[PDB]
C-alpha cells in the first residue's frame, strides 16, 4: 500500500522535502534483525540496545518534522506573497475598465500551488501516522502514538488552516470577479484532479491501444509473408521504400515518444511543467501509443494495397499519397475531435518553430526543433516524392537536396541566436549555435566535393580532406556538447556516481553508461548519413545505408530525450518550482 | 462524483436500506425549480413555501435515518449472535484435540460481513452529509449542518464502535488459534479488497483483451477473404464445418458469458454470492473476454492452416485435432498458471455435475447443467469427430446419435430428482424433472419415426402424429416453465410493470419484453434442432439448419442467464443476505 502510493503521489520537485518512508522502514527492519538473543547476553542489554535505537530513531524523526515545518512555512509565505501580488493588480485592471484571458490562467496556476501544498499536508501526515504505527507494532510499544500526539499533531505543519482559508478566498474572488458569479463554471476549471502517476490509465484507451497493436502485429506478419511467398516482380521497388520509410519513421517516432512519456511519468520527471502543459489534463503514454498504432495500421494497409491490389480501377500510386494526405488532414483537422487540444497545441508549436526567430523561444519549441534533425530524412523523402510526382511517375545534386537537409539545423541555429539576443549572454546560447553551424559546412563541402568528383576537377582531394576534417570536428563537437550539457554528465561533483552527476532520477545506473556508449556510436554514422543522401557518391548501398540508419538515429533521439528532460527537471528541482510562473501581461 | 461512487459501492442486497441520494437530489432540484417569483407574489409566500419544503425534506430525512438505525441494529445483533455461535464451538473443537480447514473459511466470511457492515457505516455517513451540504448550498441556509450534528452525528448508526471491537477480537482470535500466531498470514486472507463494481479493470488484462480482439478481427477478415478470393476446390468441406462449429460455439459461449458477467456486476446482480465464489478474488468480464479471444485466435489459426497449408509435411487433419487437444490441456492444466483457481473450480463443478446424483446439488452445478443443453451440439460434434477418426478419414441413426443428445437432459433430470429427495418437496423439484423428461420422449419418438420411414413401416404416420404432439407439449412446457419460474415474470403483483415482477434490477423495461419474445421464438426451432441432427430425415439442409440454429440457441441461453441470475438475486435480496452461510461441519 504505502511507500508506493506515497511515491505515486509525491510531487517530484519536492521529493527531498518529503518524509523518507522507505528509509524509516529499512531502519526499523535492520534494527529488528540486529536483535541480540535474549539468553545469549544479559537481559538488561536488550533494553539498553532498544533504548539506543529508540533515541536515534526519534532523533531522525524530529529532524524530518523540522525539515517539513521549515519547507512548509517558505511555501506558505510564497503563496501568501503571490496572492497579494495577484490581488493588488486586480484592482488596477478593474480600475482601467486579452488581459482577462491571461488573468484567469494565473489564478488557476496559483490555486494549483495551494492544492499541491495542501496535498503536502495531508499526504505527509498519513505518512507519519502510517510510519509510527508500524514502529509500535514491530517494537510492541505504544510510545509511538504518544510521540505523534505530543509533536506531529501540534506542529505548525498541519495544525494551521491558512491554506483552506486561502483556497476559499481564491474561489470566492474568482467567482465574483472573473466568471461573473458562476461558481460552477469557475470550479469546473479551478478544480485539479489527481496528477502525475496517480492518474489511472483509462480502460477504453488501453483497449484501443491493444486493439490497434494486435492489428499492427498481424498486418506486419502478413507483409513479411507477402515479401517471401508472394509477389516477386519487384523490378526496382526502391521508390516505394523511399516513399514509405518517411511514414515509417513518423510512426516509430510516436511509439518511442510514448515510451519517453511513460518513463518520465513513472520516474518522476515532470515533463508537463517543462513543456508548460496544463497539469489538469495532459496526454499519457497510452494516447500516444494509440495514435502511433492507428497511423501504423494505415501505413500497413496502404502497403498491403500496393502489394495485393484489391481494386484494379485505381492506380497503385494513389495509396502512398492518400496515406500522407490522411495523416495531414488528421493533424490539421479543424473539427473538435481526435485530440483537438493536443493537435492544435502541436500545430501552434510547429508554427512558432518554423516561423522563428519572430517569436520568443521557450523550451518546447527548442526541443521540437532539436528533434526535427531526426526528421531530416522525412523532409528529404517528402521533397523526393514531390519531385517524383511532378516530374516522373507516368500517370498511366539538384541544388535543393542539400538545402532541405539543413532546414532543421537552420531552425535550431536561428532559435539559439534569438535566445542569445533575448538573454544577451553568449554562453550557452551562442556556443549552441556553432554546434548546428558545422552541419552547414559539412553538407556544403560534401556537395562541392561530389560535384567536383563527378566533373573530375583537380580540387577533389583537397575538398575531401577538408570535408573529413570538418566532419570529425562536427561529430566531436555535437557529441561533447550533448554529453556535457544536454545530459549534464561528467560533472565535477560526480562523487560515488562515476562519470555522472550527483543525483540520478532513474533507478538503474547502467542505463546512463549504456546511453553514453550508444550516443557515442550513433552520433558517428549519423553525420555520415547526413553527408550521404545529399550527394552523388554512389546510387548502390547509399540509399540502403540511409534507410538502415534512418530509424537507428530516431532511437538515439528517443534515448536523448530521457536524459535531456531529466536534466531540465533537475535544474528546476533545486529551486523547488512545481507550478508554472505565469505573468499577468501589461494593462 | 457521488451518486455514482455510492452506487458502485452499495452492497446490492442492501440497496433499499441505503439512503436514496438520487431521490434527495431530485427533490432538491424540483423544489428549486418550483420557486415562485419574488415580485409576482408577496415576499412572505416565498419563505412560507420554503418552510413547507424544509419540513417535508427533513420529514423524509428523519425517516431515512430511522430506517438506517433499525437495519443496522438487526445486522449488529445478527453478527454478535453469529460470533458467539462461532466462538463457542471453537472450544468444543479445541477440546476434541479437515474441520479446521472449513473453520478458517467460516471466520473469513463472518469477517467479511463485519467489514460490509462497517462500509455501510462510513459510506452512508459520507452520503448522509454530502446531501445536506448540497441542500445548504442550494438553499443558501446553514441549518443543514446544524440538523446533521443534532441528529446524524449522535445517532447509534455510526456513533457505536462495536464493529471495530468485534473486528479486532476476530483478528486476535484467528491469529492466536487458527494461524498459530502468524498475524501477517492471517490478515493476508482475512482482509477484503473493494468488492463489486468498485474493483478497477486491470490495465494489463484490458490490453490483452484488446490485443487478442484485434488479432481476432484481422484473422476473421482473412478467413472471409480466403473463402472468396482463394481456394475453390471445396468438394464436400462439410466435415470441416462439422468439426469446427463445436469450437466456434465453445468460443461464442465465453464471449456471451463475459457479457453476462459485465451486466451482472454493473446492474448489481451479485453472481459471486450466488455461485458461492470467494468475494475477495473473482474473475471479471475482462478475463473471460481474454480467454475467449485467445481460444478464437487458436481456432482461426487452425482454420487458416487448413485453408492455406503453411507446411506440407503434416496432413491437413492434424490442425482440428491439435486445437481441441490444446483446449483440453489448457482446461486440465495441472500447473498453477493461466487461471489455475478458476480452471480447477470449474473442473470440480463439472465432475460434480457429470457424477450426479452422488453429490449434493447447489446452484452453480444446476446452472451449468442447464447450460449443457446448449452444448448438446458440441457433444454431438465430438462424437461425430471421434467416429470419423476411428472409422473414416484415411490417414494417407447408429443408436448413440440420439443418446448423446439426451445426456445433459439426463443430468438435469437426475439433479432435479436429487434435489427433490434432499428437500422432500415435489414442487418445484419434481415438476422441473418432467420438463427435461419430455426431451427424451421427443428424441426417441423422432428416431423411431425416422427408422420406420426409412424401412417403410405402416406405423410411420401415427409415430409422426405422436411425435409432433409431444414436441408441441415439450416446447410449451419448457417455455412456460422458463418465463414463469426461471425469470419470475407474469407475477400477480406486477402492478405498474405489466407482465413483470414488482422489482426489476435492470434499468430499461423493454429488455424484458424483447427477451420474452426472443425466448418464445427461439425455444421453438430449438426442439426442432434437437429432433433434427439426431435423425435421418434428410442430409441436405438438415446439417445446414443445425449449424445455423446452433449458435442462435447459445444467444438464447446468454439472454436467459441474465434474468435467471436476477431472479435468484431478488430471491436472496428480500432476506438481506450478503455473505455465504457456511457451516462448521461436524466434529
UniProtKB/Swiss-Prot annotation, chains A, B:
Cellular component GO terms held in the UniProt record: plasma membrane
Limits of the EXS domain: 397-587
Intramembrane region ranges (chain numbering): 338-355
Reported effect, residue 112 to P: In IBGC6; phosphate efflux is impaired; present at the plasma membrane
Known catalytic reactions: phosphate(in) = phosphate(out)
Residue ranges annotated as Cytoplasmic topological domain: 1-200, 269-281, 356-360, 425, 488-506
Keywords from the UniProt entry: Cell membrane, Disease variant, Membrane, Phosphoprotein, Transmembrane, Transmembrane helix
Region feature Important for inositol polyphosphate binding, mapped onto this chain: 130-137
Consequence of changing residue 401 to A: Decreases phosphate efflux
Membrane topology: Multi-pass membrane protein
Binding site for phosphate: 370, 373, 435-436, 523, 556-557
Molecular function GO terms recorded: efflux transmembrane transporter activity; inositol hexakisphosphate binding; phosphate transmembrane transporter activity; virus receptor activity
Boundaries of every SPX domain copy: 1-196
Alphabetized Pfam families for the sequence: EXS, SPX
Domain of life: Eukaryota
Effect of residue 450 to C: Decreases phosphate efflux. Decreases phosphate efflux
PANTHER family: SOLUTE CARRIER FAMILY 53 MEMBER 1, XENOTROPIC AND POLYTROPIC RETROVIRUS RECEPTOR 1-RELATED
Domain notes: The SPX domain plays a role in the regulation of phosphate flux. Inositol hexakisphosphate (Ins6P) is bound between two SPX domains of the homodimer. The SPX domain has high affinity for inositol polyphosphates and its affinity for inorganic phosphate is two to three orders of magnitude lower.
Subunit structure: Homodimer.
Record's protein name: Solute carrier family 53 member 1
Organism, as annotated: Homo sapiens
Amino acid at each position: 500500500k504505502f511507500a508506493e502510493h506515497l511515491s505515486a503521489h509525491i510531487t517530484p520537485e519536492w521529493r527531498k522535502q518529503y518524509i523518507q518512508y522507505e528509509a524509516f522502514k529499512d531502519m526499523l527492519y535492520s534494527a529488528q534483525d540486529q536483535a541480540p538473543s535474549v539468553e545469549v547476553t544479559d537481559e538488561d542489554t536488550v533494553k539498553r540496545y532498544f533504548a539506543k535505537f529508540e533515541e536515534k530513531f526519534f532523533q531522525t524523526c524530529e529532524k524530518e518534522l523540522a525539515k517539513i515545518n521549515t519547507f512548509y512555512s517558505e511555501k506558505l509565505a510564497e503563496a501568501q506573497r503571490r496572492f497579494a501580488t495577484l490581488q493588488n493588480e486586480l484592482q488596477s485592471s478593474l480600475d482601467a475598465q486579452r488581459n482577462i484571458k491571461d488573468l484567469k490562467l494565473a489564478f488557476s496556476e496559483f490555486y494549483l500551488s495551494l492544492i499541491l501544498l495542501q496535498n503536502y499536508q495531508n499526504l505527509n501526515f498519513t505518512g507519519f501516522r502510517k510510519i509510527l504505527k508500524k514502529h509500535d507494532k514491530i517494537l510492541e510499544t505504544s510510545r509511538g502514538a504518544d510521540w505523534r500526539v505530543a509533536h506531529v499533531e501540534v506542529a505548525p505543519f498541519y495544525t494551521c488552516k491558512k491554506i483552506n482559508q486561502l483556497i476559499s478566498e481564491t474561489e470566492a474572488v474568482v467567482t465574483n470577479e472573473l466568471e461573473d458569479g458562476d461558481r460552477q463554471k469557475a470550479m469546473k476549471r479551478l478544480r485539479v484532479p489527481p496528477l502525475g502517476a496517480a492518474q489511472p490509465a483509462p480502460a477504453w484507451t488501453t483497449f484501443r491501444v491493444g486493439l490497434f497493436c494486435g492489428i499492427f502485429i498481424v498486418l506486419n506478419i502478413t507483409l513479411v509473408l507477402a515479401a517471401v511467398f508472394k509477389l516477386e516482380t519487384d523490378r526496382s521497388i526502391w521508390p516505394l521504400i523511399r516513399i514509405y520509410r518517411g511514414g515509417f519513421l513518423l510512426i516509430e517516432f510516436l511509439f518511442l515518444l510514448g515510451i519517453n512519456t511513460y518513463g518520465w511519468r513513472q520516474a518522476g520527471v515532470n515533463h508537463v511543467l517543462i513543456f508548460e502543459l496544463n497539469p489538469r489534463s495532459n496526454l499519457s503514454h497510452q494516447h500516444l501509443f494509440e495514435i502511433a498504432g492507428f497511423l501504423g495500421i494505415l501505413w500497413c494497409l496502404s502497403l498491403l494495397a500496393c502489394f495485393f491490389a484489391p481494386i484494379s480501377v485505381i492506380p497503385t500510386y494513389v495509396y502512398p499519397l492518400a496515406l500522407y494526405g490522411f495523416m495531414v488532414f488528421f493533424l490539421i483537422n479543424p473539427t473538435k475531435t481526435f485530440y483537438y487540444k493536443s493537435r492544435f497545441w502541436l500545430l501552434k508549436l510547429l508554427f512558432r518553430v518554423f516561423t522563428a526567430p519572430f517569436h520568443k523561444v521557450g523550451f518546447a519549441d527548442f526541443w521540437l526543433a532539436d528533434q526535427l534533425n531526426s526528421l531530416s530524412v522525412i523532409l528529404m523523402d517528402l521533397e523526393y516524392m514531390i519531385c517524383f510526382y511532378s516530374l516522373e511517375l507516368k500517370w498511366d545534386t539538384y541544388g535543393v537536396r542539400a538545402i532541405v537537409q539543413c532546414i532543421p539545423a537552420w531552425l535550431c541555429f536561428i532559435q539559439c541566436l534569438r535566445r542569445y539576443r533575448d538573454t544577451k549572454r553568449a554562453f550557452p546560447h551562442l556556443v549552441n549555435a556553432g554546434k548546428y553551424s558545422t552541419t552547414f559546412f559539412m553538407v556544403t563541402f560534401a556537395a562541392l566535393y561530389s560535384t567536383h568528383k563527378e566533373r573530375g576537377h583537380s580540387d577533389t582531394m583537397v575538398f575531401f580532406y577538408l570535408w573529413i576534417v570538418f566532419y570529425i570536428i562536427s561529430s566531436c563537437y555535437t557529441l561533447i556538447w550533448d554529453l556535457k550539457m544536454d545530459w549534464g554528465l561528467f560533472d565535477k561533483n560526480a562523487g560515488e556516481n562515476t562519470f555522472l552527476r550527483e543525483e540520478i532520477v532513474y533507478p538503474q545506473k547502467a542505463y546512463y553508461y549504456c546511453a553514453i556508449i550508444e550516443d557515442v556510436i550513433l552520433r558517428f554514422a549519423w553525420t555520415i548519413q547526413i553527408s550521404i543522401t545529399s550527394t552523388t557518391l554512389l546510387p548502390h548501398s547509399g540509399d540502403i545505408i540511409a534507410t538502415v540508419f534512418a530509424p537507428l538515429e530516431v532511437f538515439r533521439r528517443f534515448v536523448w530525450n530521457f536524459f535531456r528532460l531529466e536534466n531540465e527537471h533537475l535544474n528546476n528541482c533545486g529551486e523547488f518550482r512545481a507550478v508554472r510562473d505565469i505573468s499577468v501581461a501589461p494593462l
